């Protein structure tokens, strides 16, 4: 039943007695459900150290991944350029999913097309689909550039993207001069971050490879900045803010800030802002090039160093206190611009916040996951804060990365109870927080399920999720946050202590029981 002025949604409608007894009749009657005592016995078991051994002995099954496939990153990369339509050569299902995934995270429209390859195109190759699709997309959606990536179906059958686009131009489907950069992005290689690296290098190549002879390093007096797979709008914004503040001339290669944050003013803008074709063409003329997420920008680095002759700085992601200092001093070195008083004061304010909050942060244990650069910088900041990053998980991380992160942890006493796990998933991590319980988890929305499992074991076993990373689907507008610079460091710190304090207030809210420690001032 429903009362018109107090209408109940799914929760709490189904908690009413008529639905609760109806559901019981469905279970006892036709579900043949295992007895509750067996369901609770196996749960208890999935909690033990014994189950953990079996779990980690897996070699073929992957349960609850913490990564996506290559094209997703390729789509995001392409969206960072002025009036460009991401085009994914292969099956259309992929695109629908790419779009839905990004719509749910950024709460914005994401524009991308497929050339919808069917069973017959799987057998004959996607050459006709490439011809029609490039023509249909350019004429209907009118981009100034179409950036082509691929789905696994098209990779397995070896559709030569270069040939197909060249034949498309020769038959008059699209003009010869129309920019159509490409990148082979196999789903069964790496992850979404590799797809971004691949797609970026493809665009860099398209605009610079043939043009190298008239280029002079440092002649435009700028520093190119390559962001990498970035899903927090505050990150594009903080980097642009700190360089402008220093008076540094720069060019951000792949900038989706505007398309992913258009105003609801009355009209729909499919394209907005982005890195211009000319910024891409003029890019080898820069003093140097700074990659913000080096661990997934390796191929780009090889092209920039080998092709553009730039001496890419050995710089970690600028997250945390030390790596932001390093980034700023490096940008200062290259540009010749001194680090201004505004940034000097901003650094002191982050340090101030750290001294104000160290008492609650100290010795706090965390399980965390994410992309290699992100999780690497998260680990360093946590260390600078006096926290212990006990379980560090990076599904899409490689051996050399684990080495580097082990080096980071070995340089600090707070990393003496930490272990790094690459190639492992959230079902693996679920076990680690049960057997070696940390205070919190720092991860994406997929960790909400780990939190529910720990809570099911009991309240004292609950490990709360602090939502930092991608994707965040269950909270609103967190994509507007900052993770980079001192600004991002300040946001992360506040979120960490306040999560600790929210949790402490809950634990001490019990009247006459635990509320003796429910203090007004903390």
């Amino acid at each position: 039943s429903q009362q018109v002025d107090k209408i109940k949604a799914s929760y709490p409608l189904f908690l009413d007695q008529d639905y609760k007894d109806m559901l019981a009749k469905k279970r006892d009657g036709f579900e043949e459900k295992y007895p509750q005592d067996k369901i609770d016995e196996v749960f208890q078991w999935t909690t033990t150290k014994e189950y953990q051994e079996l779990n980690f002995q897996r070699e073929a099954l992957t349960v609850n991944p913490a990564k996506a496939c290559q094209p997703l990153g390729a789509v995001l990369c392409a969206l960072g350029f002025e009036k460009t339509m991401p085009y994914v050569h292969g099956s259309q299902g992929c695109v629908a999913y790419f779009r839905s995934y990004f719509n749910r995270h950024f709460r914005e429209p994401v524009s991308c097309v497929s050339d919808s390859m069917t069973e017959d195109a799987a057998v004959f190759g996607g050459q006709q689909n490439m011809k029609d699709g490039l023509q249909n997309c350019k004429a209907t959606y009118k981009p100034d550039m179409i950036a082509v990536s691929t789905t696994c179906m098209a990779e397995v059958i070896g559709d030569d993207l270069n040939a197909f686009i060249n034949n498309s131009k020769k038959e008059g489907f699209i003009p010869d001069e129309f920019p159509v950069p490409f990148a082979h992005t196999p789903s069964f290689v790496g992850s979404h971050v590799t797809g971004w690296d691949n797609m970026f290098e493809g665009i860099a190549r398209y605009f610079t490879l043939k043009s190298m002879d008239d280029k002079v390093v440092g002649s435009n007096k700028k520093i190119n900045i390559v962001p990498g797979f970035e899903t927090y709008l505050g990150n594009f914004r903080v980097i642009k803010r700190m360089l402008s503040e220093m008076g540094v001339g720069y060019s951000l290669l792949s900038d989706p800030e505007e398309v992913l944050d258009t105003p609801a003013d009355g009209q729909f803008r499919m394209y907005a802002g982005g890195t211009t074709q000319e910024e891409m063409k003029d890019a080898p003329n820069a003093l140097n090039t700074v990659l913000l997420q080096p661990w997934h920008l390796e191929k780009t680095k090889k092209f920039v160093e080998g092709t553009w002759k730039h001496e890419v700085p050995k710089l970690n992601i600028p997250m945390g206190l030390d790596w932001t200092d390093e980034f700023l001093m490096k940008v200062s070195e290259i540009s010749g611009q001194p680090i201004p008083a505004s940034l000097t004061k901003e650094r002191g304010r982050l340090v101030d916040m750290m001294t104000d909050s160290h008492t609650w942060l100290h010795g706090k244990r965390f399980a965390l996951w994410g992309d290699p650069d992100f999780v690497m910088g998260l680990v360093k900041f946590l260390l600078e804060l006096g926290c212990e990053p006990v379980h560090i998980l990076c599904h899409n991380g490689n051996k050399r990365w684990k080495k580097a992160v082990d080096a980071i942890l070995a340089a600090s006493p707070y990393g003496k109870n930490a272990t790094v796990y690459i190639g492992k998933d959230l079902w693996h991590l679920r076990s680690l927080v049960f057997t070696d319980k940390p205070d919190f988890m720092i991860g994406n929305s997929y960790g909400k399920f780990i939190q529910r499992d720990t809570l099911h074991k009991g309240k004292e076993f609950e490990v709360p999720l602090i939502r930092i990373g991608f994707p965040i689907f269950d909270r609103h507008h967190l994509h507007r946050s900052t993770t980079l610079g001192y600004e991002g460091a300040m946001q992360i710190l506040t979120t960490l202590v306040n999560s600790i304090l929210e949790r402490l207030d809950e634990e001490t809210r019990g009247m006459q029981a635990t509320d003796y420690n429910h203090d007004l001032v903390r």
Binding site: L321, D322, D325, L328, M329, S332, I339, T344, R347, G348, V351, D352, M354, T355, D356, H358, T359, H362, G363, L383, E384, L385, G386, S412, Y414, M511, Q512, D515, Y516, N517, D519, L520, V521, R522
Partner: protein, 476 residues
Amino acid sequence: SREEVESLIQEVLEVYPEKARKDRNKHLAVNDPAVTQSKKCIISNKKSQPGLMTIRGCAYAGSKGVVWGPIKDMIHISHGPVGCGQYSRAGRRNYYIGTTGVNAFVTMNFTSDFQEKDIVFGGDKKLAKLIDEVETLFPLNKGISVQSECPIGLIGDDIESVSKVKGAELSKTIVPVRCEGFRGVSQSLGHHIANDAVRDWVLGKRDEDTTFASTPYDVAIIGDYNIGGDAWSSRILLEEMGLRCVAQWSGDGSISEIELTPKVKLNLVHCYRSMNYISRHMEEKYGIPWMEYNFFGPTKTIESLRAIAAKFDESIQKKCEEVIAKYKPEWEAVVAKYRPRLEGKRVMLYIGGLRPRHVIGAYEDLGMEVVGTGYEFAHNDDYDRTMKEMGDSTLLYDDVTGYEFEEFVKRIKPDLIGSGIKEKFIFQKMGIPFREMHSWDYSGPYHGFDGFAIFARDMDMTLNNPCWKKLQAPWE
């Protein structure tokens, strides 16, 4: 360091006008542990010089804030304008067990919130009405206190008459405290007024009464305000020693405990400054002897337990050795873990009227030396007790100004500072590790053996924290 602290003192004082210069000079000194009498070394409990940013509070803070406020089952009324009551509302962590708003009222703020017309016409009729309102709205209260703010004392509001008539009528104990903020020179006179209000209106209530079943081992903790649970962490030891702790003064204290205190055999005084008055009174009226104890750190806790148990029989003394042995493995573990992390570190302290000398032994159990110490409001008898507990050529400062403390810290350069919230963010800015020694920086306990574990943990987390290495920019 022997004459370097005297030239420091003179150099610091050079900034004051002449009148303030001559007064502050006698409030600062260098210690000589052979000086049983502190009055030829330092004077104290004199008024603060105007405009010099003193750290001191007032008589109301001493009465309502520290002595009466902690008593859980009474309703304490901040009588006057809305300010005092709001700022002191749950600022001090005097812990208690109780259902707040029903039978306990410590974290709440009851005020008469004076408006202009209460100043001009007087507020005795308003007070009487307020008392009828706390009665219908908080029926389970076991008494009421009326804490005077400045205006009540000028205006001549006859609050004892109101307390007398309303108390007899409602069959309630209503205590009027003339603790208006301008009286005295600090929180200290507020302690005194409060102690007097306790004896005149509450202590002798159960005088002709012989219903309580006494035991030769009955004691009372006098002057432990249970900051972070300090008193509970102290009475666990006392009761494991075979003693029966009939009362806790103010910390988690109830009115009945106070009424039952004249029935005990011994008054164990922790905070000498705030409650020596009521203890002395209990000795001349009820014959109850009192002794001072220190539960900060193992060396002092052990010493205290032994002295306290020596006032009783052989069975309590035997249990005393049982308890010392029980906790010996534990506090030695703490020393083994944290002392190597803390040895040789220097601490400057500036707290109220007891901690500046009381936490010294606990710091020394971790190998740390206190190079400077001082009180906001102590009297010379506290400074007398301070000379034995401090090192030789160390700095002593009474009612230190914001200027003096900052500059003394700039010379001396301590590794850690222990003071309150008003100076915390000054020294963190300066790159010096800071621990709040009033609120324990929302940690605690620090009393007893279990408290020592938390104390060491805390000094270590702050002193050897990674943030202190990052105050200076690598590009300058």
